[PDB]
Scaffold this active site. Structure first.
Site, short mmCIF file in Angstrom:
data_model
loop_
_atom_site.label_atom_id
_atom_site.label_comp_id
_atom_site.label_asym_id
_atom_site.label_seq_id
_atom_site.Cartn_x
_atom_site.Cartn_y
_atom_site.Cartn_z
CG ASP A 1 2.76 -8.06 16.96
OD1 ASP A 1 2.23 -7.21 15.82
OD2 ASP A 1 2.72 -8.71 17.73
CD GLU B 1 1.55 -12.96 8.69
OE1 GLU B 1 0.79 -11.71 8.77
OE2 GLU B 1 2.17 -13.75 9.41
CD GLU C 1 20.88 -9.25 5.65
OE1 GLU C 1 21.05 -10.72 5.54
OE2 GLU C 1 20.98 -8.89 6.40
CE1 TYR C 2 16.04 -10.84 -3.14
CE2 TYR C 2 18.35 -11.71 -2.98
CZ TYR C 2 16.56 -12.14 -3.77
OH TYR C 2 16.09 -13.17 -4.28
N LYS D 1 0.92 -1.15 0.02
CA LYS D 1 0.31 0.57 0.26
C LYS D 1 0.58 1.66 0.42
C1 LIG Z 1 8.70 -10.06 -0.10
C2 LIG Z 1 9.80 -10.68 -0.35
C3 LIG Z 1 9.74 -11.44 0.04
N1 LIG Z 1 10.98 -9.80 0.96
N2 LIG Z 1 10.00 -8.39 1.32
C4 LIG Z 1 11.47 -7.60 1.79
C5 LIG Z 1 11.39 -6.69 2.48
C6 LIG Z 1 11.78 -6.99 4.14
C7 LIG Z 1 11.87 -5.68 4.86
C8 LIG Z 1 11.47 -4.00 4.51
N3 LIG Z 1 11.87 -3.00 5.09
C9 LIG Z 1 9.91 -2.11 5.68
O1 LIG Z 1 9.34 -2.08 5.07
C10 LIG Z 1 10.26 -1.00 6.40
C11 LIG Z 1 9.03 0.35 6.60
C12 LIG Z 1 9.47 0.21 7.39
O2 LIG Z 1 10.16 0.90 8.51
C13 LIG Z 1 8.10 2.19 8.53
C14 LIG Z 1 8.61 3.04 9.10
C15 LIG Z 1 7.23 4.14 9.37
C16 LIG Z 1 6.20 3.74 8.67
F1 LIG Z 1 5.89 4.61 8.69
C17 LIG Z 1 5.98 2.77 7.77
C18 LIG Z 1 4.74 2.30 7.37
F2 LIG Z 1 4.47 1.33 7.23
F3 LIG Z 1 3.43 3.16 8.13
F4 LIG Z 1 4.44 2.97 6.33
C19 LIG Z 1 6.79 2.01 7.33
C20 LIG Z 1 11.02 -4.35 3.14
C21 LIG Z 1 10.63 -5.30 2.03
C22 LIG Z 1 12.34 -8.71 1.59
C23 LIG Z 1 13.93 -8.30 1.88
N4 LIG Z 1 14.49 -7.22 2.36
N5 LIG Z 1 14.89 -9.21 0.29
C24 LIG Z 1 13.98 -10.54 0.00
N6 LIG Z 1 12.44 -10.34 0.04
C25 LIG Z 1 11.48 -9.39 0.62
#
Ligand SMILES: CC(C)n1nc(-c2ccc(NC(=O)/C=C/C(=O)c3ccc(F)c(C(F)(F)F)c3)cc2)c2c(N)ncnc21
Ligand SMILES: [Cl-]
Length: 255
Positions: free
Chosen positions: A130, A134, A85-86, A17
């Site tokens: 939490d 997921e 990090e990925y 979103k």
């Molecule tokens: C789908 C796939 C599986 N996926 N997804 C990831 C992934 C991991 C971590 C993140 N981190 C965040 O989203 C952080 C958001 C915020 O600190 C925040 C702060 C203030 C707010 F108001 C908000 C708000 F949400 F309210 F806006 C957020 C993002 C993507 C990923 C990865 N790193 N590597 C490989 N695959 C990956």
């Protein structure tokens, strides 16, 4: 100091979103990583600017093997960009869909990695969550990584302890309750207080009413019963979990 032109963009890993997550690559080193794009609009629609401020400065000064690392950030006056990090193997949640339930070896190691990560967080004066499946990602070897997922990719009642729902004050002990809900979900395939309504789930949590399927062993039943205590002060320390008999006997990762 970073700029968007510093990176090549690959496929979308998740559209949410507040924004999207893309596979990306730093142009100088060819390093693979993940790039979050957050729309200032949706950030403006709600009020999190101050809340966004917080997480970033924290996660930045935070370095641990079981915590997804945040490398940097920057903006363009319409968007906010996060460099993370990925984690190639994806989400613990999706794994649980594929396998249905985990074995004690797999579970005991996950719990070990979570306990270590949480214990580091407490030391730096931080309380996370939490830790839902997921929000748990997996490194290239299969090692768990706490993300604190932005929802750029339940209910959330199933993982909350009694003190947090009922309006009362709470401390680090909330993390020990989560750990026990998770341990149970790993071995059984569903959280211990799951129900058709919010009302029943509430009732079962506040009254700590749950049971085990036959196949859960006594050492498992034992650790879970110790985490899931209505009185927070009666919940063990992170340190005691690491030294639990069932953990040490089934975990492949040392404490
Ligand atoms: C789908 C796939 C599986 N996926 N997804 C990831 C992934 C991991 C971590 C993140 N981190 C965040 O989203 C952080 C958001 C915020 O600190 C925040 C702060 C203030 C707010 F108001 C908000 C708000 F949400 F309210 F806006 C957020 C993002 C993507 C990923 C990865 N790193 N590597 C490989 N695959 C990956
Ligand atoms: Cl009770």
């Amino acid at each position: 100091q970073w700029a968007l032109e510093d990176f090549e963009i690959g496929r979308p890993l998740g559209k949410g979103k507040f924004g999207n997550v893309y596979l990306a690559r730093e142009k100088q080193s060819k390093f693979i990583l993940a790039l979050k794009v957050l729309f200032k609009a949706q950030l403006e629609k709600a009020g999190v600017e101050h809340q966004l401020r917080r997480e970033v400065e924290i996660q930045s000064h935070l370095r641990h093997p079981n915590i997804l690392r945040l490398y940097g950030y920057f903006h363009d006056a319409t968007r906010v960009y996060l460099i993370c990090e990925y984690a190639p193997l994806g989400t613990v949640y999706r794994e649980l869909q594929k396998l249905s339930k985990f074995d004690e070896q797999r579970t005991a190691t996950y719990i070990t990695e979570l306990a270590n990560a949480l214990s580091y967080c407490h030391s730096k004066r931080v309380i996370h969550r939490d830790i839902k499946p997921e929000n748990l990602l997996l490194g290239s070897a299969g090692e768990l990584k706490i993300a604190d997922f932005g929802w750029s990719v339940a209910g959330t009642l199933d993982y909350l302890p009694p003190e947090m729902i009922e309006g009362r004050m709470h401390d680090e002990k909330v993390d020990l309750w989560s750990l026990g809900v998770l341990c149970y979900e790993f071995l059984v395939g569903k959280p211990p207080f799951e129900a058709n309504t919010y009302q029943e789930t509430y009732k079962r949590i506040s009254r700590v009413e749950f049971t085990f399927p036959d196949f859960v062993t006594e050492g498992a039943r034992d650790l879970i019963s110790r985490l899931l205590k209505h009185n927070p002060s009666q919940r063990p320390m992170l340190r005691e979990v690491l030294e639990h008999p069932w953990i040490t006997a089934n975990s492949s990762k040392p404490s």
